Amino acid sequence: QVQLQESGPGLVKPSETLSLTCTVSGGSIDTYYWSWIRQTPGKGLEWIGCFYYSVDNHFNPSLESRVTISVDTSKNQFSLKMTSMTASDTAVYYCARNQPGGRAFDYWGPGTLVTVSSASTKGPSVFPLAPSSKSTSGGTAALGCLVKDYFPEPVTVSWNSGALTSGVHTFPAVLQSSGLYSLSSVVTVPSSSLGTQTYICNVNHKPSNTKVDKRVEPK
Amino acid sequence: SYVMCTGSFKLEKEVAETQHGTVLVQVKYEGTDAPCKIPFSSQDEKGVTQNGRLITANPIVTDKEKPVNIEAEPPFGESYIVVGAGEKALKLSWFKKGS
Amino acid sequence: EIVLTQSPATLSLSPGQRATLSCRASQSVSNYFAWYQQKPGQAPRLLIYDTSKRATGTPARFSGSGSGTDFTLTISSLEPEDFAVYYCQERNNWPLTWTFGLGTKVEIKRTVAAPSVFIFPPSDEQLKSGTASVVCLLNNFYPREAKVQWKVDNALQSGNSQESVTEQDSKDSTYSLSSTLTLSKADYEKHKVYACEVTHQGLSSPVTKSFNRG
């Protein structure tokens, strides 16, 4: 029941400072070690640093000079500060608990993608992909949502607020010539009950605080 | 540098007194994060930890199968001898006679 | 300090087979290594720790072993949900640091499966922008390679479509693939018939889905 949740800005302009916060539930951050870790496509997982509240903190020698950690135990939060962000610092940043009495990390946050760029945040437009007569394969109908023109990554999509997961495929984003990303999310369902079941896609684009729910109905 | 041991300790042999009012606690470590520094404190009877009272300078587990001797000077009366940190803390009750 | 090399980079095995992943260390530190399993879009998950101990939630088919210089993760009976990237990890004592290997990607072979194909006309909402996207879906196929072609009034298109493929499904190990043709609203009205033609190793005859309204 120990859970961690990163919160960050998505975008940070080059040379500025990255500020992230980890909010922990299910236990107090006043004991045990807690860490920041990042993952980049080209370089893999990299440990950043850790602290034990009011005791000590250790940092990766590669990043020591750009990195500091503060702790707010009254909110069960701790934060990462990384100065002079470069393009090579684009990565998914995780917070995690160090395993007590061990050498591993036993609980992880979901991670927040940080994109170092000087482009501006843009929220997506969401359009239905309606099940028509041309989206039926026998007794099976496909439907979805098209999530167009956003920056930076990522967009997440759920269906019916999480209650519809079977048959869902949410595609990796494509980069359009415009520099904006696009993706679709689709789901296959019984053709027989298109007019009786309700299909809503819930689109989340954290970098622009955009939340869109789109009802997907046939025609 | 060193990390603080976050694992659990067990008493290997009984606490033992000395000529000079100190106690001898031998603990075996069960964590795998050795080398690490042993958390040590002297919680009074109020549950609040007390200041210093450790005779051993920087006790460290080097190998979780090698026991570590620790020397402490508890206060008079009732106290606790606390080895380990937070949830996995060994809390040894103690009475030092003749204040 | 310590450098972990994982072998092999990619493992591709059929369900029920045995999988062994190697983690070689440049120098010995401790005998207590960790393994993480990272499924698509998730954080790494602690799988095995202290070289051989199963983390909470880790099934019995996962075992770890190893002495000092190389360590081993074994998956005894491989299952489709085991599609993941597996990382080993150790803590360096001096200088103090936690270090990961580059991961071994485990892929799950399965029987050939032909795509089910669906086509979606552009949305009315989108049409009152300037742009029309038509989406062709290839659902639940294996293996990956496929051929999507766009015909607009039977003229073969080129230059205005983009594709995206999912990772293998955690349940049935298939792929799905989207192809999106993007036209202006102007060009979208000049034509009536919009067709997506799909060829695949499991099909033996190309499959076209089309529509003709708007």
TrEMBL record, chain B:
It is found in: Host endoplasmic reticulum membrane; Virion membrane. It comes from the Viruses. Residues 1-96 form the Glycoprotein E immunoglobulin-like domain. Homodimer; in the endoplasmic reticulum and Golgi. Interacts with protein prM. Interacts with non-structural protein 1. This is Genome polyprotein. The gene is E. The chain holds residues 298 to 396 of 495 of the full protein.
